[PDB]
Structures are given as C-alpha cells and as structure tokens.
Amino acid sequence: LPEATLQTLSNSWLNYQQMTGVQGHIVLAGTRDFAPGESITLSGFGAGLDGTAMLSGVNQQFDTQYGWRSELVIGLPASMLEPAPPVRSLHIGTVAGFTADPQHLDRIAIHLPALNLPDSLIFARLSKPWAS
Amino acid sequence: SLLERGLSKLTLNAWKDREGKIPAGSMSAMYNPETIQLDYQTRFDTEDTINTASQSN
C-alpha cells in the first residue's frame, strides 16, 4: 500500500496520462506575456483546433534571422508509472534496539548499512516459517 | 632593351613534387599570349550579433 488512501495517487496517474493526450507547440513572435501555467485558448480557427489549452513552457529563441520568437509548449512527454523507484535487491541490516510500532503492526525496527543513516530507524516486517 | 632586341618567349616548366626536386619536361611557347590576367578572390561573411549594433564581417 503506497500511501494511506489511494485516491490521490489514482487521480495523479490519470492526470499525468491526460497530459500526453494533446501535446504540441505554438510558435509565436516575441512576447514575455506567457508563463508555463497560463491556460490560453484558440478561438478564431476552424473546427479542428478551437479550445482552451494549458501550457507547459515557453522558449525564447533569439537569433539573427527570425528575430525573437517566444515558442509556447503544450503537453508533457511520457511517464514511468511507478509508485516509487524500485529497488529489487536483497539487503542486510542490523536490528535497532527496541521501538514500538506507531502503525500498530508488529514491525521490528532495524537499520540498513546500505544507507549511511546510523541515527534513523526503519520498521520492517518479520517472516516466520509457521506463523499462524 | 638596354642590350638587344629579341623576343623572350614564355616557358612552361613542370616538376612532379611540390618542392621541385624531381623534374618533368619543359616547353617554351611560340606566339606569346598577348594578354595575361591574374584574378584574386577573398571570401568574407557578415558576422551576426544580437547584442550590439557594430557591423563587421
């Protein structure tokens, strides 16, 4: 279970995949009136491209030809969709004194020397052959 | 002038290497060319800048 409730992480992956749906760029000419969260709208065009689009960034592009061209950016590229970046190794650690579990399981507070954290404690689950 | 009056034809001397150690043949042209021309050409390109207004190439 990644977080306490999985409402927000379920909303968050559905929103970061919507941003890959519509993505492109609007090459404008030379203004500093835009920001990466402005949510501009296209009005005077045909039926294909009319509507409000939310930006992702601006690119300024000073050069000799073309003058100054503030390119706008729409959309986000892709996403990995991991709950956390995975570590798939077996590690060893020492048991760390005694500290009661604030999450009210029976988790045993250990260290991990792969981390250089001698002060902080990590609660870990105990696997028994039988348990019952 | 200053010695005598006789035509000095041009001579085409050829080698094989750049330096001239190894010689090829040679020939002197009858009927001097009546015109020679040497043409120069130096190529420039206008440098561009977006800060200042100084104009060089």
Side-chain angles (χ1 to χ4, degrees):
Chain A
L1 191 62
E3 286 85 6
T5 184
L6 289 173
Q7 181 187 3
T8 303
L9 182 138
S10 176
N11 287 320
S12 177
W13 291 2
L14 189 273
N15 292 326
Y16 274 94
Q17 295 293 318
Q18 285 292 321
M19 302 303 287
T20 60
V22 177
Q23 56 182 355
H25 63 86
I26 296 172
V27 181
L28 192 66
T31 181
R32 297 184 69 180
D33 293 331
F34 291 93
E38 285 291 326
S39 179
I40 58 99
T41 182
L42 296 168
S43 66
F45 295 97
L49 70 173
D50 274 333
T52 300
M54 181 169 65
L55 298 180
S56 296
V58 189
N59 308 122
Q60 293 299 107
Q61 301 175 0
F62 293 89
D63 48 353
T64 303
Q65 68 174 355
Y66 286 161
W68 168 40
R69 283 177 178 261
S70 72
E71 176 188 1
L72 304 177
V73 180
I74 299 169
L76 275 73
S79 63
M80 181 60 204
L81 297 185
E82 294 289 330
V87 43
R88 296 180 180 179
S89 300
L90 295 177
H91 295 280
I92 65 172
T94 61
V95 185
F98 178 74
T99 302
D101 194 355
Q103 203 175 4
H104 295 286
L105 302 168
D106 288 333
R107 296 184 295 128
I108 298 170
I110 62 169
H111 292 292
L112 293 173
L115 284 75
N116 292 120
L117 277 301
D119 292 332
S120 67
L121 276 73
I122 291 166
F123 288 97
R125 197 83 173 273
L126 179 65
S127 293
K128 282 176 249 68
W130 165 228
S132 279
Chain B
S1 68
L2 275 298
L3 273 302
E4 49 90 18
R5 51 187 179 94
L7 280 172
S8 67
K9 309 291 183 181
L10 58 77
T11 304
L12 181 61
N13 294 316
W15 281 269
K16 291 183 182 179
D17 54 354
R18 178 70 66 92
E19 297 297 327
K21 295 178 176 64
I22 302 167
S26 67
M27 63 178 289
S28 69
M30 60 185 286
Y31 293 159
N32 293 121
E34 169 199 1
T35 304
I36 60 97
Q37 58 178 355
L38 284 85
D39 196 355
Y40 270 101
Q41 184 72 42
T42 301
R43 296 184 185 273
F44 294 100
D45 192 75
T46 68
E47 68 94 19
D48 296 333
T49 186
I50 64 171
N51 303 320
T52 61
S54 66
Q55 294 180 356
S56 66
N57 54 7

